[PDB]
Design a protein around this ligand. Structure first.
Ligand SMILES: [Ca+2]
Ligand SMILES: [Ca+2]
Lengths: 554, 554
C-alpha cells in the first residue's frame, strides 16, 4: 500500500566546517571513514564510520571446531546446526576386534566406525570435516575413538580339557563363529553440549534421573555418541563328561566303540589297563598321580550371542577463512583508524563476498560477513580494534549468493538488515516502510508499503542514496540534479511518514562561481552531516577527497 | 682508544614546515610515527617511522612446529637448534608388542618410545614440546609413531607336533622367553630436513650412495629417526624324531621306559598294538588312516636372539605467542599508519619484552622481537602492513633478560644492533665507533673506541639522543641546555669522525618571546629533519604534540 509524504519545508544551514586534518583519500579509491552514497545496501548506518572485510588465504589448517553455542554450552561459538551419525557395522573383521578387545586378548584392537557420509556433508550448510588426526587404530587414521565397550550380558567362557595332574577342566575364550550372525550397532548420533546418558534404572524416585556415560569436548569439536547392540556370535564349549568304567582280562571289549562312556580293560601284564575303543570326539584324561583315577567326556560346542554397547567420541570441524576488518570513523575532530583480525590471518585472498554493518557512528559495529557466497559466515560484535564477540553461521546454498536473498536470511537469522539503502528516485522519492521506519529488520506485513514523497520530482532519477535512521528522521544523502548549476541536497524524512524536508547546502558545496562540489560520501550523526566530494584536475586526474561538516537548523 | 672530533661549524636552516594534518597524539602518550629522543636503544633509525610490538594472550594451542630453515629445507622458518633423541627400551612388555607385531599376531601392537627428557627440554632454548596427539598405541597417547619394523635376520618359526592324518609336523610362532636377555635399541635421533638413510650396500660404484628409509615432514614439525638393534629372546622348538619300532606278544617290553625310541607291542587280541612306556617328553603320533604308520620324537626348545631395527617419526613444536606490530611513518605530507599480525592474535597480554627495529624511513623495517626475556623470538622482515619473512630464534636464559646482553646476542646472530642510541653527553658529547660508523653491528676491535666532540661542553648532561646514520652523517636529535632561553640543537657528526656540526633551530622552535618548544621526538631522512614537541596547558594538562619539518643547509 502507498502512503503520500508531503514536503514540509527546507532546513537551513546553521554552520559549515572544513576537515583538512585527515588522511588523504583518492577520489579514485574512496573514503576510508565515510560511506559512499552507493553503499546504502551495505549498512544500517549510524555515523561517519566505514567498515571493510578482507579474507585471508587459507588451507585445511584454518579450522573451526564444531563448538555449538547453546543454553547448555553458552561459551560455544557456532550457531549453525550439525548432526553427524553413523554405526559400527558388524562383520568378521570388526567382530574380531571387538572380541579380542572385550576378552582382553589385545587392548589395542578396536572396530572402525562407519559415519553416514551425508550427515558429515551436512547439506554443505556448512560442509563439515572429520578430524582423522584425533585417533588411530593401528595404521588406520580415524576421527572416531571408542571410549567404552560394555557387554550387554556377562561374557561367557568355554571349558577346556581336564588337566592331567589336577584332573580339572580349565577355561579359555569362546571362539568367534565366522559363519555366524552379525548385528550392526544401533544408530549412534553425536552430541556436543551435554553428556551421553542412560536412564537411571532407579530414577523414580531416587536421583539422578539419568546417568552420564561419556562427555563431549565442544571446545575441541568433539562429540559423544552411543552405538548400542553391536552383535556377533561365538561358539562356547561345555565339558560334558561320560562315566569311565573298568573291566579285566579275560573279559572282552564291546564289539563296537563306546559312545556313552569309556571302558578301561586291565590285564595281568598291564594292571594299569588300556581303554576300549571309544567314539571319536571323546576325550579321556588319565590322572598322572593315579592312572586308575581318570575321567572322560566331550567338549560340546554351543552357539551364543554376544552383544555390546560401544560409547565413542568424534572430532569435527569446518574450514574457517581468517578475516580482517577495517573500522574507521570521524570523532574528536580527527579520523580514527582501527583494524582487527580473526584467526591466523596471513595474506589477503580477496574482499569478503558479502558484508553488512550496523554502526553507531563511534567505532561500534555489529556485522555479518561471509567470505564466500555460501557457507561459513561470522556474526561479529566489535568496538574500534577490539572483537567483543563472534558467532558463526552458514549461508545456505539455496541462496545462490544472492545479495537480496542473503540480506533477508541475515535479517531472519540475525536481526540485521541494510536499512541505509531503501531510498530511490523515479518520478518521485520513494522508500519502503521497513527501511524508513528502521526498527524491524525482517520482512512482514506492511513492511513493503511504499512511502512516496510529494514535490520531489525535480531530482534526478540516477541520484544515489545512503540513509541514516536517527531519532525522528531518516537522513539520506545525495539528491542530485541533471543541471549541475543546481547543487545536491540532503533529504530528511520523518520516520512516522508525516512528511519530509530537504536541506539545501549549495553554499557549503560552492567551490567556484556557478560550480559546486557534488556529495559523493555521506553520513549523519548527532545532528551533524558529514560530506565527501570527489575531486579531479583539469586534465582528469584523481585528487584528495574534500571533506566538510554541515550543521542543519532543526 | 679516544679520538677527538672538532666542531667544524653550524648548519643554518634552509626552510621550516608545519605538520598540522596528522592524527593528534597526546604529549602524555607519545608520537605514533616519530621515535622519542629516549628511544635510540630501540632503533637503527632511517626516518620518521615508529614501530611497536604487542604480545597476544596465548595457550598451548598457539604452536610453532619445529620446521628448521636449512640449505636442505630453505622453506623452514626456525633458526634455533633442536636435537631430540631417545630409545626403545627392551623389556617383557615392549618385547611383547614387537613380537606380536613382527609375527603378525596383531598389527595394532607397538612398543612405546622413550625420549631423553633433557633433549626435549632443549636447555629451554627454547623449551620444546612433544605432540602427543600425533599418535596412540591403544589408550596411550604418544608423540612418536613407529613406521617400519625390520628384523635384522629372518624370523624363525618353531615346528609343532606332527598332524594325526598327515603325519606332518606343522609350524607356530616361537615363544618369547620372559626371563631372557633384553637389548635396548641404539640411539635414535630425529632429523627434519632430510630423510633417514642407510649406506647403499652397493655404493662403490653403483648409485645412490645412500638409501632413504623414511622421511620427516618439517612443515608439521615431524622428525625422522632410526632405532637399531631392539633385541629380545625367544624359544624355538625343533621337532627331533626318534625311531618307532614294533615287537609282538609274547616278547616283553623293556624293563625301563624307552628314551631313544618308542616301541609298540602288538598282540593277537590287539593287532594294532600298545606302545611300551617311554620317557616323558616324547610324543607319539599314530597316523589315523594307518595306525601301523606312526612317527615319534620331541619338540626340543632352543633359545634364539631376535633383533629388529625400528624406524619412527616424532612430532614436536614450541609455544609461539601471536604478535601485532604497528608500523607508522610520515610520507607524502601525511602519516601512514600500518598494522600487521603474526599468528592467531586474540587479546593483548602486554607489550613485547624486547624489540629492536632497523628502518628505512619508508615503512620498510627488519626487526627482532622477543615476547619474553628469554625463549622464542622472531626476526621479521616487513613493509607497511605486510610480513615479508619471519625467522624464529630463541634468546638463551643465560642472558637474564638483559637488554644490553640481548642487544649483543641479536647483533651476533642476526646482524642487528640499535645504532641510534650511542650518543651521550657528560663533560662533552661522546659516542662509540660502532654506532657512529653504523656499519658493523657486532662488537669487535676498535668497535668501542670513543669519539669525543670538542666544543660541546655547554650542552646539558641530561640531554637524550636518538641518532640517524645516513650518508656522511650521524644525525642525532636533542642537545638541550640547562637554560631554557637556549633552544635545543641537532647534532651532525661525520661518520668518519673528521668533525661535527650543530644546527641551531631556535627560530623553528620559537613559540613565544624568550620561550621555545623542546625537541622531544626526532628523526632524520633524505636531508630533512622531523621534530615533535610536547605540549601542555597553563594548568599542566597534556595537549597534542607539535610537529614540524626542518631543512638544514648542507
Ligand atoms: Ca532511481
Ligand atoms: Ca649524559
Amino acid at each position: 500500500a502507498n502512503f503520500n509524504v508531503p514536503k514540509l519545508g527546507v532546513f537551513p544551514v546553521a554552520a559549515v566546517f572544513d576537515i583538512d586534518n585527515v588522511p588523504e583519500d583518492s577520489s579514485a579509491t574512496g573514503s576510508r571513514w565515510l560511506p559512499s552514497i552507493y553503499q546504502g545496501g551495505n549498512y544500517w548506518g549510524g555515523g561517519p564510520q566505514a567498515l571493510h572485510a578482507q579474507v585471508s588465504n587459507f588451507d585445511s589448517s584454518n579450522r573451526l571446531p564444531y563448538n555449538p553455542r547453546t543454553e547448555n554450552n553458552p561459551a560455544g561459538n557456532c550457531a549453525f546446526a550439525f548432526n553427524p551419525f553413523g554405526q559400527y557395522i558388524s562383520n568378521i573383521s570388526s567382530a574380531q576386534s571387538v572380541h579380542r578387545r572385550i576378552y582382553g586378548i589385545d587392548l589395542n584392537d578396536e572396530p572402525l566406525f562407519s559415519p553416514n557420509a551425508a550427515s558429515i556433508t551436512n547439506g554443505g550448510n556448512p560442509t563439515m570435516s572429520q578430524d582423522t588426526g584425533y585417533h588411530n587404530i593401528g595404521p588406520i587414521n580415524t576421527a572416531y575413538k571408542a571410549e567404552i565397550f560394555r557387554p550387554v550380558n556377562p561374557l561367557p567362557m568355554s571349558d577346556t580339557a581336564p588337566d592331567p595332574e589336577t584332573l580339572e577342566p580349565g577355561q579359555t575364550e569362546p571362539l568367534i563363529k565366522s559363519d555366524g550372525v552379525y548385528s550392526n550397532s544401533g544408530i549412534a548420533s553425536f552430541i556436543f553440549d551435554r553428556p551421553v546418558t542412560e536412564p537411571n534404572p532407579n530414577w523414580p524416585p531416587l536421583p539422578p534421573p539419568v546417568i552420564p556415560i561419556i562427555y563431549p569436548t565442544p571446545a575441541l569439536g568433539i562429540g559423544a555418541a552411543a552405538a548400542y547392540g553391536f552383535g556377533y556370535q561365538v561358539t562356547v564349549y561345555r565339558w560334558e563328561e561320560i562315566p569311565v568304567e573298568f573291566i579285566a582280562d579275560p573279559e572282552t571289549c564291546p564289539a563296537q566303540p563306546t559312545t556313552d562312556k569309556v571302558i578301561i580293560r586291565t590285564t595281568d601284564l598291564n594292571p594299569e589297563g588300556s581303554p576300549c575303543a571309544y567314539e571319536a570326539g571323546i576325550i579321556l584324561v588319565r590322572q598322572t598321580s593315579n592312572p586308575m583315577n581318570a575321567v572322560a567326556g566331550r567338549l560340546v560346542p554351543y552357539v551364543e550371542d554376544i552383544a555390546v554397547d560401544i560409547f565413542l567420541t568424534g572430532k569435527f570441524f569446518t574450514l574457517n577463512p581468517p578475516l580482517r576488518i577495517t573500522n574507521n570513523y570521524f570523532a574528536d575532530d580527527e579520523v580514527k583508524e582501527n583494524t582487527v583480525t580473526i584467526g591466523n590471518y596471513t595474506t589477503t585472498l580477496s574482499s569478503a563476498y558479502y558484508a553488512v554493518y550496523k554502526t553507531d557512528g563511534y567505532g561500534g559495529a555489529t556485522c555479518f560477513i561471509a567470505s564466500g557466497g555460501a557457507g561459513i559466515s561470522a556474526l561479529v560484535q566489535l568496538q574500534d580494534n577490539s572483537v567483543l564477540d563472534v558467532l558463526y553461521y552458514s549461508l545456505p546454498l539455496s541462496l545462490g549468493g544472492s545479495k537480496a536473498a542473503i540480506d533477508e536470511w541475515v535479517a531472519n537469522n540475525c536481526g540485521l538488515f541494510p536499512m541505509s539503502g531503501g531510498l530511490d528516485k523515479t518520478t518521485l522519492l520513494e522508500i519502503p516502510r521497513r527501511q524508513l521506519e528502521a526498527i524491524n529488520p525482517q520482512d512482514g506485513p506492511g513492511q513493503y508499503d511504499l512511502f512516496i514523497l510529494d514535490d520531489s520530482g525535480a531530482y534526478a532519477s540516477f541520484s544515489s542514496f545512503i540513509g541514516y535512521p536517527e531519532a525522528a528522521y531518516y537522513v539520506a544523502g545525495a539528491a542530485t540534479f541533471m543541471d549541475v548549476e543546481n547543487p545536491d541536497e540532503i533529504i530528511f524524512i520523518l520516520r512516522n511518514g508525516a512528511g519530509w524536508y530537504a536541506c539545501e547546502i549549495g553554499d557549503a558545496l560552492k567551490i567556484a562561481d556557478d560550480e559546486f562540489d557534488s556529495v559523493d560520501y555521506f553520513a549523519y550523526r548527532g545532528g551533524v552531516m558529514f560530506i565527501g566530494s570527489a575531486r579531479y584536475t583539469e586534465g582528469g586526474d584523481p585528487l584528495p577527497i574534500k571533506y566538510r561538516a554541515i550543521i542543519p537548523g532543526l
